[PDB]
Write a protein that binds this DNA or RNA. Structure first.
Lengths: 241, 246, 246
DNA sequence: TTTT
DNA sequence: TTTTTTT
DNA sequence: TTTTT
């Protein structure tokens, strides 16, 4: 029995030797969060929301080459290392904190109505919890779930994305929506997180806003615009609209 | 500011408030007007072959960067430009090209004969008598949201979209692979975006197509299980007790 | 007129006014590179299967090179891919079940693999062990190797039927598409299922029928199975109820 | 607006 | 519903 | 514990 590594896999396939892989250190993002979060709080709240909006756009440019910003620069990742998903996740955790201040919250909610991911969910933007979910959308749920009080909002969003992946236009091949939820629970069990009635009810408040979201708007305002004519064709075919 | 690497380093390193912009506004009708001439250089028999072998042809194109003539599919990733050529954009051009040829008697006759053996055809039990019926056949399997933006193709798109929506069970359409409500929903967005109005002429035109669809004899399945294989496959489903055959 | 479907033929289809038609091997790939994999230990092979998913991520980490062979992660017909490696090893392992002593080693070791026991597959004879080697493999690839046709397509059907019981996610693995691809392979080699091949298939199907399938998602999701299911049903149909006070 |  | 990181 | 819509 040998530790599962990259150099062992090349030897597995090239040698007549009998090899097995131990399976059975430890990275904590919450601990990582406590460190680098102070550094991201020096970012402007506006600079953070631009990051969320251009996430995929910013990502492609960063992946062009070794990307260096300040003293940190973004294939086995060390526990102190900064990753794009880790940068994204810090920025999201940071922003949720600002939803406790009314002045920042108004700017966030208003600007947060203009995200590409937002409106696609058709998520209602009413209270602070409504804003936090918007900040949550598109983030690395396995990472963020490890931060305290972020456990339920993470696993709740994970299930909704798993359930409604079609409506949300989520390609299961591009994004494994089951695996994501599977990973979240792995993280919660590592912190021995237990889901009590308070956490579950807290989750249900989160869950409510997600049910009230409307994943497809444009396609449902044009259909009703032509519904008089559309329904006349429905009727000729089997069933009556 | 324009999105660059130096603006991103300033986003993360400065207490300054920064902004940048994302996707490309695309209009298939314009794309069609441009690239349709390049597709007119294909043989009509070659076009129907493309349609008949759609899935097979796609996979080969998707193996690598595919270049033909001036056109290149550029494989995938980095999103898609409004000027760029895609497989679906290619497929839809070929269908649009074919539908125009239905104004010609000799061409109408060759297509009608050649397209009668396609797998998607026969699955609909579509009768091929007149020109309008043949257009519907060319239409089958095509990207209705793309083709609908092209002039005069609005009604045939939305009527077929609704029919697929009503008869999606009879047609053996998997709701997970193809959301038949979403598809109709996209077509109307396209029609509404060009301010298409359904007057009595268009509605009357729509009904001419719809008539052809009621008279059609829709058939589920029509997959790649041989007439030699259907008999043996279902014995095993029954062995697992999961066959509905009788 | 009728031509083989290739990349140069598709360019000729689109760029030439000539009339072209089509009208429709890994086995060859198998005969070549399998000898490279035969130097592996049978135990090393079973380690590969057991640790399939984990090893894959390490391989997908970068361009993976072992011996003369390298996995990039475009693909040549001769290039080696992860699935091609996995399928080679599974074919290799099936050959070794023709030897009684090796059959014991495989039977003993593979009895502890996660996919087995999830199937609740009983391990008695050689044919039972082959099905065990078969689990999780690429059915369309392995189907192209001779004499692997029936075990491939029978297992493909069992999975299409029992995907619910096996805890198989239709989103991650299209259980119909897989079956569809296997038959496509059989038709491409013009495979015929006579009474004997079906009799052979029925022998396999029997063993899968005698199996008792029990699957649960990973380790942690089963630990949280009681609380998790409560959340799925709240996102069922459509509901917008808010909860106000006065 | 994509290997539907 | 052959080629891919498809439980 | 990664460029996962």
């Amino acid at each position: 029995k040998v530790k599962l590594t990259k150099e062992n896999i090349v030897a597995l396939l090239t040698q007549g030797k009998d090899l097995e892989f131990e399976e059975n250190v430890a990275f904590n993002f919450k601990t990582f969060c406590l460190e680098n979060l102070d550094q991201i709080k020096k970012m402007s709240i506006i600079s953070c929301l631009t990051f969320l909006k251009n996430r995929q756009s910013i990502m492609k440019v960063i992946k062009q080459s070794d990307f260096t910003f300040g003293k940190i620069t973004i294939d086995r990742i060390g526990a102190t290392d900064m990753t794009f998903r880790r940068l994204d996740s810090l920025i999201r955790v940071r922003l949720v904190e600002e939803t406790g201040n009314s002045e920042n919250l108004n700017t966030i909610k208003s600007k947060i109505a203009s995200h590409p991911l937002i409106q696609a969910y058709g998520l209602p933007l009413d209270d602070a919890k409504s804003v936090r979910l918007a900040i949550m959308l598109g983030g690395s749920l396995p990472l963020i779930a490890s931060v305290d009080s972020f456990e339920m909002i993470s696993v709740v969003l994970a299930i909704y994305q798993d359930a409604k992946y079609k409506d949300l236009g989520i390609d299961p091949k591009k994004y494994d929506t089951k695996e994501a939820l599977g990973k979240v629970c792995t993280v919660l069990k590592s912190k021995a997180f237990e889901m009590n009635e308070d956490q579950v009810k807290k989750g249900k408040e989160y869950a409510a806003i997600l049910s009230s979201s409307n994943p497809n708007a444009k396609g449902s305002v044009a259909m009703e615009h032509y519904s008089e004519t559309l329904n006349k064709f429905y009727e000729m075919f089997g069933v009556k609209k």
